[PDB]
Design a protein around this ligand. Structure first.
Ligand SMILES: CCCCCCCCCCCCCCCC(=O)O
Ligand SMILES: CCCCCCCCCCCCCCCC(=O)O
Ligand SMILES: [Fe+3]
Ligand SMILES: [Fe+3]
Ligand SMILES: [Mn+2]
Ligand SMILES: [Mn+2]
Ligand SMILES: [Mn+3]
Ligand SMILES: [Mn+3]
Ligand code: NA
Ligand code: NA
Lengths: 286, 286
């Protein structure tokens, strides 16, 4: 459908818009390139491990690789919906969001290739709860925006993408990687990637907070919808976490070899904490 | 609609894919930031000009600013269509394409703001032929891909976007800027931007060539469609060029002051040459 006119011909970019500022920060802080990371030491670590210890890191990598690919594809409808609404500054920012996720897909795929498991199909570590979030709910909620860009639909998309997938699962995954592999002194290239990912993620979550809060600001009754959509996905979040935990408790060999005291209770409480903390970053009033 | 699985969990990125290589080149060669460009000398040049000379550069800037905004919005459906087809490497590359165009929108808008014409509505320099391409045909052809991703639709979208808008109009515009303002020693910040834009554009055009050629490779009869879609838009291309030329010939004061011999015939032949050259980068056979 036709353009009526163009903001940057009639006027200029809104230089003070919060998403324009976030866009500027993303260009400044987003120079990293997965292709520059040295994975040579990761190859050697992984080869040195036994079959049993080798398996241990794969479930978390399986979760991340599919998750990065899902969001790369599933962010496009949000960019379209906001473009149609004429929110140019949000679109500018979303180009950095999409390009970030592309590099995240690239980072985990380079690690898989480097350590010699590219040919292995890691879908075996996606349980039913994971599939519900990443194979189904995420794409349903985002694709909806093509035909329905009501405040209800936008809130649900932002909640599932930014507050659950990124703000709850991804954040807890970064924490888990550091608690286990950083302590062991294993997989330095991967952990360097994880640090860059964690920094990009801060902006992604802030876009979701901005989006949800500007809709709640119009009608405080959307606050209840946000809470409800958070709670709907909790059982799948914790059902995936419990599955990973249970795989971890059965495959102890890595924790024994590296003298790691993997506290699964601490990791569980971190996920619960992340979830409640995201809930609290949205104000009912304002 | 649900994901069936994920390429980077089952396998890896296709490291040898042409669009993966182009994506790698884009990350290496796309570090520039419009926010770093010094426009202080451009402000002074523009202030030093008289009202008559001031007007002279505005029509070309008006064309570019709207053009950059249109493609930023209108590339999204191509990314979606290729994602739905499972072309992950093309999607990775398109994140760099979209982010490039965002910086291009930003560059011209910063120049407008800097030289003191942000508040001026430059839509007055968009004639009917321009509107036909940028307000109508471009968004029609791209939005079609949401509901129709047939080889016919993809070829038409790539032809209008990459071969006409970028490969014919944008390229001739970069050439025009250099022939006029670079010779005058005017607007150094802007010309620095134009150099970065011209470098990004090389990748954008290569994506269009790749896309059109891989469809023609399947059925040489799509070649005729490509030619036909090129020819359909020619009258609007040359109708806009003739309008700009005619504005240029009426406002001679800048060319006189800076001792510039603006050869409008040369600029016209460059557009004609660009158009035929794009036609020839697609092989009917292969
Ligand atoms: C064993 C403790 C459980 C910790 C939770 C681990 C969650 C794994 C992360 C997989 C999904 C990551 C989603 C990526 C989101 C993004 O890239 O923006
Ligand atoms: C006076 C000689 C005519 C030269 C032709 C000038 C064309 C102006 C360019 C306006 C459209 C630019 C489109 C941008 C495309 C992109 O950013 O990929
Ligand atoms: Fe993210
Ligand atoms: Fe371009
Ligand atoms: Mn269960
Ligand atoms: Mn005419
Ligand atoms: Mn990510
Ligand atoms: Mn451009
Ligand atoms: Na303006
Ligand atoms: Na794999």
């Amino acid at each position: 459908v036709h353009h009526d006119g163009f903001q940057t011909v009639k006027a200029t970019i809104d230089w003070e818009h919060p998403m324009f500022k976030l866009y500027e920060k993303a260009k400044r802080n987003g120079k990293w390139n997965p292709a520059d990371i040295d994975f040579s030491q990761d190859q050697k670590d992984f080869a040195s491990l036994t079959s049993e210890e080798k398996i241990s890191a794969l479930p978390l990598v399986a979760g991340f690789s599919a998750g990065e690919e899902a969001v790369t594809l599933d962010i496009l409808p949000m960019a379209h919906a906001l473009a149609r609404q004429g929110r140019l500054e949000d679109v500018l920012f979303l180009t950095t969001f999409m390009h970030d996720e592309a590099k995240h897909v690239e980072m985990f795929s380079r690690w898989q290739q480097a350590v010699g498991i590219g040919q292995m199909d890691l879908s075996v570590f996606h349980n039913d709860h994971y599939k519900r979030i990443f194979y189904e709910a995420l794409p349903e909620a985002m694709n909806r925006l093509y035909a329905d860009d009501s405040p209800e639909a936008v809130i649900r998309a932002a909640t599932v993408y930014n507050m659950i997938v990124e703000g709850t699962l991804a954040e807890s995954g970064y924490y888990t990687f550091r608690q286990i592999y950083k302590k062991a002194g294993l997989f330095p290239g991967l952990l360097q990637g994880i640090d860059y990912l964690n920094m990009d993620e801060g902006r992604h979550i802030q876009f979701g907070i901005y989006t949800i809060q500007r809709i709640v600001n119009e009608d405080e009754r959307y606050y209840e919808l946000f809470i409800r959509y958070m709670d709907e996905l909790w059982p799948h979040v914790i059902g995936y976490v419990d599955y990973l935990t249970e795989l971890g408790k059965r495959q102890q060999q890595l924790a024994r070899t590296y003298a790691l005291e993997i506290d699964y209770d601490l990791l569980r409480h971190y996920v619960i904490k992340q979830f409640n903390l995201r809930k609290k970053q949205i104000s009912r009033t304002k």
